[PDB]
Design a protein around this ligand. Structure first.
Ligand SMILES: CCCCCCCC/C=C\CCCCCCCC(=O)OC[C@H](COP(=O)(O)OCC[N+](C)(C)C)OC(=O)CCCCCCC/C=C\CCCCCCCC
Ligand SMILES: CCCCCCCC/C=C\CCCCCCCC(=O)OC[C@H](COP(=O)(O)OCC[N+](C)(C)C)OC(=O)CCCCCCC/C=C\CCCCCCCC
Ligand SMILES: CCCCCCCC/C=C\CCCCCCCC(=O)OC[C@H](COP(=O)(O)OCC[N+](C)(C)C)OC(=O)CCCCCCC/C=C\CCCCCCCC
Ligand SMILES: CCCCCCCC/C=C\CCCCCCCC(=O)OC[C@H](COP(=O)(O)OCC[N+](C)(C)C)OC(=O)CCCCCCC/C=C\CCCCCCCC
Ligand SMILES: CCCCCCCC/C=C\CCCCCCCC(=O)OC[C@H](COP(=O)(O)OCC[N+](C)(C)C)OC(=O)CCCCCCC/C=C\CCCCCCCC
Ligand SMILES: CCCCCCCC/C=C\CCCCCCCC(=O)OC[C@H](COP(=O)(O)OCC[N+](C)(C)C)OC(=O)CCCCCCC/C=C\CCCCCCCC
Ligand SMILES: CCCCCCCC/C=C\CCCCCCCC(=O)OC[C@H](COP(=O)(O)OCC[N+](C)(C)C)OC(=O)CCCCCCC/C=C\CCCCCCCC
Ligand SMILES: CCCCCCCC/C=C\CCCCCCCC(=O)OC[C@H](COP(=O)(O)OCC[N+](C)(C)C)OC(=O)CCCCCCC/C=C\CCCCCCCC
Ligand SMILES: CC(C)CCC[C@@H](C)[C@H]1CC[C@H]2[C@@H]3CC=C4C[C@@H](O)CC[C@]4(C)[C@@H]3CC[C@@]12C
Ligand SMILES: CC(C)CCC[C@@H](C)[C@H]1CC[C@H]2[C@@H]3CC=C4C[C@@H](O)CC[C@]4(C)[C@@H]3CC[C@@]12C
Ligand SMILES: CC(C)CCC[C@@H](C)[C@H]1CC[C@H]2[C@@H]3CC=C4C[C@@H](O)CC[C@]4(C)[C@@H]3CC[C@@]12C
Ligand SMILES: CC(C)CCC[C@@H](C)[C@H]1CC[C@H]2[C@@H]3CC=C4C[C@@H](O)CC[C@]4(C)[C@@H]3CC[C@]12C
Ligand SMILES: N#Cc1ccccc1-c1cc(-c2ccccn2)cn(-c2ccccc2)c1=O
Ligand SMILES: O=c1[nH]c2cc(C(F)(F)F)c(N3CCOCC3)cc2n(CP(=O)(O)O)c1=O
Ligand SMILES: O=c1[nH]c2cc(C(F)(F)F)c(N3CCOCC3)cc2n(CP(=O)(O)O)c1=O
Ligand code: NA
Lengths: 140, 392, 176, 134, 49, 126, 49
């Protein structure tokens, strides 16, 4: 039957489809970076990332209010990773930050590319986790 | 002297004999005597007891004591067929079946809370409405920022969706195809939700429908809001003490400990404590008095649920009387001819004082919590200006 | 069980309470009893046993044994169990169109963005002809056929809803 | 104070008498006292703004106390009226009697006093914009 | 359960087995009835219904 | 950082109550909280007006007047009685018809007495 | 000419949206008036079950 928890899983298939599109665009941006460019991939990345947090930050306050404690708990490892990159390591920046003024010197370029496949692997597993517990809460 | 069994008739001063009295057991004594063929003398008991064997002197009192010791020949009265009485007198078959029942106060209009205005829609709907509001506002923001035609950042998307839901129109509207699919489906959502709020509110205000919180003694055992209590002594007191079933042991550990004392001392004290506790006292008493007080004035009390046990009222004779067999067959004649049902409908229902519109304006109480949110939102808006004036 | 709520059956109270606890859990007992009668243990009218049996019944009644045995066989060996506001199940399909319409609009935002980034009289001449021929076709077929109105006027039976049509029909503007 | 039904001319207080609504109007009592406090704060801070205009912020803040006062009337008068209607409801409905509540000229004076300090709230803020642009 | 055939004036059933000596007692859902109480002795009701 | 002086603010709030509001709309967060809770206020108040008026007009349409004695025997909220003597009182006393025995059961036990003493007294009480 | 088509479509939806809310209020009121059987006097009155 349709319930509020089943709607909280329907509403996060729709927005995790945006979260994977943020990351397909994020692996192309660093691949096209190595081919060519700094100031544009400063600006094009910097606009993208703050939607990616708060959409996932929406999911934290949505499954908290839905009483889905396993689902809220599985968004916790991505959440506390996200608090670190904005409260303590968004290195100095001050336009938005983080995929900003600090490009080559090439040590963050390897750290971003390991992150960029780690985001896609979590989001593609979150998409089928959300699609399963949608079908779970609807049928049951 | 017990109602409706024997009541002294209104002008009993100018009357004499078997016609000073009226009631169920006066109309029953008439029926027993014309089927058994005798002439009778209605005689109210002395002590005022029903009958009990004294623990020290071993002497029966009440109506049982008059039949054992010779002062009476029959006791046509609400006298409960029990084990200790059957050993000394002889009962007939039960002319009335009854048991322990629940008396609550009759439910009322049930004054509103703060968030009573939310009640036409379930709380599971309102939670889905709030999270669909942020849902369509993020999707407006995703659609308008990436693949632009904007003027639709995250706070102009939250204001488009708030104004669309409140049916206040807009100042800006989306210009692209994909922003108009977001905007137009959220418009259709709002149209169904606001129309079903007004339609379900019109149903509530048209049809009053008062439900009782207690409809069983299981429902009393699963709560501590409503305090339930028997009389201080008697058979309803003794029932919950020695019970072993599942539920009446739960109801007994409640009543024996609870402060203030739920045990009233008189039936009229228990009825008044029902009427004067606005739905917080449920009185446990026999089902025959419960159906009678429900029919007296005021209409303030109600019987709920089934009975808790099964007992009966018998017509008693001394052990060895020659009335014992014909009165027993007289009761079974009166049962199957519908006489006993007819006498109960006369004295409980046809002589019942309680028997068995005009929509009123909405009071401020019904909608008062919308005023609290408004001034609570006016004061919250004056703080956000104060933070905006400091931060800039 | 086969009349959808349009039949009520008047029986004794103790079978009505027993069938209520036996699968399928279709039926329920409503109201109080219409009369008052009782079941007794009977003895041959001259027996030396009718008096100890009478004091046994009154002893078993006051110790809760008769109420214990009825809960055992009606309820404990049973097979069944034991808001006025509008629910989500009634307005669930407007949430499906909302989620379905938000997912459609993010799909359109893809094939706008791909079309914007990557980037006459002949097209509209081609489309306003094939829509005009098939307009003449589909209405030309429709007014010249006799499949407009499927109409039945049958009768029901109160026996597992046995259905017998007597006036089934299909109609058009010119044929019946 | 009673009249004409057991006409006791003794004006009883609310604490030394024991009706359930008389305890319900105790709950709606602090808000006309918070309102009268904010009118007296906003008034003595308006007169400072008339005798020392070298600091202009006296006029705008006294406008805020004139507006926080009137919002405390409305919550008080909603609480006051809703406390009456709740206790008119929780009574044994009998058609052989009648009930009748009314309001008097003290309820009217608290209602008109909303209009005057919200008007004093606006005029103190427009007076601030006259002083600040000068 | 027990009924009198008005032609023969004989009882068929459990009331029959008590009146004509075959049974000594009938522990059964037997309704306490006027026509039965004349020919057999019921106890107090073990079940009210 | 006006368009929202006191007379345009009285016109925003008037048009928001009537749900007719095209004009300037607030652009600051603090102006949009006051705008937003006043929008929710009128959504409840205007819906409560229509729903309570629909409750009135439905209940005023459910009203069935008396047109039978079975309507009197069911509705025990309009009182009914006869004259204190004569054929009409003795009709209900002797009647064995269901609806007429219910009416006599009501009339013989009714406080105060529904039985008038004169025909002019009974037309007076109506 | 654009305000005649705009004006009759405004009057169309004023009737259609009001008819939706009024027929839904008619449904929810009648579904709230429904009294189930709970007595034999409810059976004797309701001659439809
Ligand atoms: C313009 C748009 C309008 C904006 C209006 C916003 C207001 C509404 C926003 C959010 C809703 C807040 C409350 C949601 C409650 C979740 C309920 C749920 O579906 O899950 C169920 C659980 C279990 O219930 P229980 O057994 O614990 O209660 C038992 C109750 N008893 C004590 C009677 C026995 O309930 C829980 O606690 C779940 C765990 C914690 C959830 C509540 C915490 C709220 C956190 C963030 C939301 C922001 C709040 C701001 C105000
Ligand atoms: C998004 C921005 C725009 C919106 C602005 C929001 C501000 C105004 C909102 C709320 C403030 C007004 C009311 C305060 C709520 C607590 C008072 C209260 O009595 O609540 C009771 C509720 C349950 O109500 P009921 O219907 O079941 O009553 C049942 C009564 N019976 C038994 C008769 C049936 O239970 C509870 O406490 C529920 C938990 C209370 C949560 C409300 C938080 C209040 C705190 C601060 C207010 C803001 C100040 C602004 C500066
Ligand atoms: C000032 C804001 C309103 C304050 C919220 C009042 C909530 C409390 C009111 C009365 C107290 C009774 C609460 C008891 C009911 C359920 C318990 C609960 O957990 O209490 C929170 C629920 C959450 O809902 P639930 O039934 O799913 O929890 C099911 C939880 N279980 C399984 C335990 C039942 O009640 C809810 O908060 C649902 C109500 C959410 C109200 C927000 C919508 C108002 C404005 C809408 C327009 C703007 C949005 C669109 C633009
Ligand atoms: C009831 C429980 C649920 C409430 C959740 C509250 C927790 C906060 C977390 C998430 C809330 C929002 C949901 C996710 C939002 C993702 C989108 C986003 O985050 O967008 C990123 C913004 C971009 O900014 P932009 O508009 O200039 O880009 C446009 C440029 N242009 C202006 C030139 C056109 O970056 C920014 O800093 C945005 C600044 C603020 C970010 C939070 C949004 C405000 C809160 C909304 C929820 C409350 C609803 C009302 C009750
Ligand atoms: C229960 C479910 C239903 C209830 C919910 C109701 C709402 C339904 C959801 C969405 C409906 C959207 C409303 C329709 C209007 C949107 C169309 C539109 O205005 O989108 C704007 C875009 C951009 O405009 P532009 O200035 O760049 O174009 C001209 C370029 N220039 C000026 C440079 C030469 O235009 C374009 O994409 C043009 C291409 C549009 C292709 C798809 C539209 C369908 C076309 C024909 C079928 C008729 C639909 C009837 C329904
Ligand atoms: C967007 C468009 C909006 C515009 C709509 C305009 C409509 C009205 C707007 C505001 C009016 C609300 C304020 C009303 C004041 C509270 C009055 C009240 O609710 O309590 C009534 C009291 C007491 O009644 P009583 O026992 O003394 O008389 C009984 C006479 N007997 C004994 C013969 C039956 O009123 C009294 O008479 C006390 C003595 C006289 C003092 C009150 C006079 C108030 C008249 C005008 C000032 C209000 C503002 C301008 C209008
Ligand atoms: C029946 C019950 C409901 C009504 C009860 C009344 C309660 C009213 C509460 C608060 C409102 C305060 C009254 C308004 C007058 C004070 C302001 C004033 O006086 O100066 C300011 C105004 C200039 O306004 P604005 O340019 O910002 O307009 C916006 C246009 N934008 C944005 C293009 C610049 O100047 C002017 O209009 C000249 C003033 C016009 C003269 C008549 C207006 C009333 C003035 C004083 C009497 C106070 C009433 C007390 C009762
Ligand atoms: C039952 C209960 C009642 C139900 C209904 C009540 C509804 C009440 C809610 C109303 C708000 C909903 C719509 C939200 C959008 C308003 C905010 C806004 O309009 O924009 C906020 C700011 C300032 O606007 P602006 O300078 O960008 O606009 C430029 C144009 N000009 C220059 C003219 C100013 O934008 C920025 O600076 C962003 C920078 C950082 C943002 C901080 C994140 C926190 C935001 C939380 C949002 C909700 C607050 C709590 C409520
Ligand atoms: C929720 C209660 C307790 C207080 C919330 C108010 C404060 C904490 C929040 C509300 C949202 C935030 C806003 C952030 C953006 C704007 C824009 C800025 O130009 C000034 C301030 C202003 C208008 C807000 C200041 C207040 C703010 C930091
Ligand atoms: C955009 C996508 C990815 C988000 C979720 C898709 C939703 C909106 C779609 C998917 C297909 C639809 C299903 C259709 C069949 C059933 C049966 C119906 O009785 C209820 C809902 C249910 C169980 C589904 C609900 C979800 C549904 C309406
Ligand atoms: C479900 C899918 C097929 C429906 C979505 C419609 C999309 C595919 C098509 C319809 C044809 C295209 C339109 C063609 C005309 C204009 C003009 C052009 O300057 C840009 C895009 C724009 C505004 C349209 C955008 C949408 C478009 C790319
Ligand atoms: C900053 C200001 C304006 C907003 C909050 C303050 C005051 C004015 C208001 C707004 C809503 C009010 C509450 C409303 C509900 C209850 C229940 C009521 O039985 C008494 C008061 C009480 C407990 C509240 C008292 C305080 C109250 C909070
Ligand atoms: N009455 C009223 C009312 C007025 C405005 C908004 C809501 C209500 C209201 C609605 C409902 C309700 C409930 C179910 C279905 C439809 N409506 C209930 N209540 C209410 C009334 C008294 C006590 C508690 C709630 C209400 O106060
Ligand atoms: O034989 C008995 N028959 C009884 C009959 C009735 C009545 F219902 F009025 F007919 C009552 N009441 C019920 C409520 O309290 C007031 C009188 C008590 C009876 N008692 C004493 P109890 O059962 O020990 O309480 C008997 O002993
Ligand atoms: O033969 C009779 N014819 C009657 C005719 C009438 C009249 F209607 F006036 F014609 C009346 N009234 C009924 C109305 O109030 C005025 C007197 C009484 C009559 N009675 C006595 P009732 O019938 O016992 O009451 C008769 O006996
Ligand atoms: Na209606």
């Amino acid at each position: 039957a349709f319930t509020f928890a089943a709607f909280c899983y329907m509403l996060t298939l729709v927005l995790c489809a945006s979260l994977i599109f943020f990351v397909i665009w994020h692996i192309i941006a660093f691949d096209e970076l190595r081919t060519d460019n700094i100031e544009r991939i400063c600006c094009l990345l910097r606009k993208l990332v703050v939607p990616e947090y708060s959409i996932h930050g929406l999911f934290c306050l949505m499954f908290l209010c839905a009483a889905e404690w396993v689902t809220l708990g599985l968004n916790i490892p991505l959440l506390f990773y996200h608090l670190w990159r904005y409260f303590h390591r968004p290195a100095d920046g001050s336009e938005v930050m983080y995929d900003a003024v600090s490009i080559m010197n090439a040590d963050i370029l390897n750290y971003c590319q390991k992150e960029s496949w780690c985001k896609l692997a979590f989001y593609l597993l979150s998409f089928f986790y959300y699609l399963y517990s949608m079908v779970y809460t609807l049928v049951s | 002297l017990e109602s409706p069994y024997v009541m002294m008739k209104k002008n009993h001063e100018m009357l004499e004999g078997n016609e000073r009295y009226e009631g169920y057991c006066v109309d029953l004594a008439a029926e027993i005597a014309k089927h058994c063929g005798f002439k009778y003398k209605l005689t109210i008991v002395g002590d005022g007891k029903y009958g009990a064997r004294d623990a020290d002197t071993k002497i029966w009192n009440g109506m049982v004591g008059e039949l054992v010791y010779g002062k009476a020949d029959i006791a046509i009265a609400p006298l409960t067929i029990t084990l200790v009485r059957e050993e000394v007198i002889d009962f007939s078959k039960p002319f009335m079946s009854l048991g322990i029942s629940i008396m609550i106060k009759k439910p009322q209009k049930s004054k509103p809370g703060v968030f009573s205005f939310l009640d036409p829609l379930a709380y599971e709907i309102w939670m889905c409405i709030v999270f669909a509001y942020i849902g369509v506002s993020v999707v407006l923001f995703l659609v308008s920022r990436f693949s632009p035609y904007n003027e639709f950042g995250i706070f102009n998307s939250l204001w488009f969706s708030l104004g669309a839901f409140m049916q206040q129109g807009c100042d800006i509207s989306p210009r692209s195809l994909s922003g108009r699919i977001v905007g137009g489906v959220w418009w259709f959502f709002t149209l169904i939700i606001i129309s079903s709020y007004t339609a379900n509110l019109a149903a509530f205000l048209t049809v009053e429908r008062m439900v009782s919180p207690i409809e069983s003694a299981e429902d009393l055992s699963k709560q501590t809001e409503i305090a339930y209590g028997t009389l201080d002594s008697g058979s309803t007191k003794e029932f919950f003490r020695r019970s072993k079933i599942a539920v009446f042991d739960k109801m007994w550990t409640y009543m024996r400990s609870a402060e203030p004392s739920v045990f009233v001392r008189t039936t009229a004290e228990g009825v008044a404590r029902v009427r004067k506790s606005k739905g917080k006292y449920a009185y446990l008493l026999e089902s025959t008095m419960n159906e009678y007080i429900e029919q007296r004035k005021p209409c303030d009390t109600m019987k709920v649920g089934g009975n808790l046990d099964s007992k009966g009222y018998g017509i008693a004779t001394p052990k060895g009387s020659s009335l014992g067999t014909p009165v027993n067959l007289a009761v079974l004649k009166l049962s199957e001819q519908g006489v006993l049902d007819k006498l109960k409908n006369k004295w409980w229902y046809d002589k019942g004082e309680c028997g068995a519109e005009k929509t009123s304006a909405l009071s401020l109480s019904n909608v008062a919590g919308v005023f609290y949110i408004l001034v609570g939102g006016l004061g919250l808006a004056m703080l956000v200006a104060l933070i905006e004036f400091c931060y800039k | 069980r086969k009349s959808k709520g349009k039949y009520a059956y008047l029986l004794e109270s103790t079978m009505n309470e027993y069938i209520e606890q036996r699968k399928p859990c279709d039926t329920m007992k409503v109201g109080g009893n219409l009369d008052s009668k009782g079941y007794g243990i009977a003895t041959p009218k001259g027996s030396s046993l009718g008096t100890p049996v009478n004091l046994a019944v009154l002893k078993l009644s006051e110790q809760g044994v008769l109420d214990k045995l009825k809960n055992k066989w009606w309820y404990d060996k049973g097979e069944c169990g034991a808001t006025s506001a509008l629910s989500l199940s009634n307005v669930a399909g407007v949430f499906y169109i909302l989620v379905g319409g938000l997912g459609l609009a993010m799909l359109v935002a893809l094939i706008e963005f791909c079309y914007k980034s990557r980037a006459g009289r002949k097209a509209l001449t081609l489309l306003s002809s094939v829509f005009a021929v098939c307009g003449l076709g589909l209405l030309g077929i429709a007014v010249s056929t006799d499949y407009w109105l499927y109409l039945e006027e049958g009768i029901i039976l109160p026996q597992n809803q046995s259905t017998e049509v007597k006036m089934s029909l299909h109609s058009g503007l010119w044929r019946v | 104070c009673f009249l004409a039904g057991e006409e006791r001319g003794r004006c009883f207080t609310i604490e030394y008498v024991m009706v359930n609504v008389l305890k319900m109007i105790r709950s709606a009592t602090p808000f006309p006292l918070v309102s009268l406090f904010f009118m007296f704060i906003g008034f003595i801070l308006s007169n400072i703004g008339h005798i020392r205009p070298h600091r202009t912020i006296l006029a705008f803040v006294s406008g805020i106390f004139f507006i926080l006062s009137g919002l405390s009337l409305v919550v008080g008068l909603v609480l006051y009226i809703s406390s009456i209607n709740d206790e008119m409801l929780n009574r044994t409905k009998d058609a052989e009697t009648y009930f009748n509540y009314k309001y008097g000229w003290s309820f009217a004076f608290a209602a008109i006093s909303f209009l005057l300090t919200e008007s004093a709230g606006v005029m103190s803020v427009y007076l601030f914009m006259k002083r600040y642009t000068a």
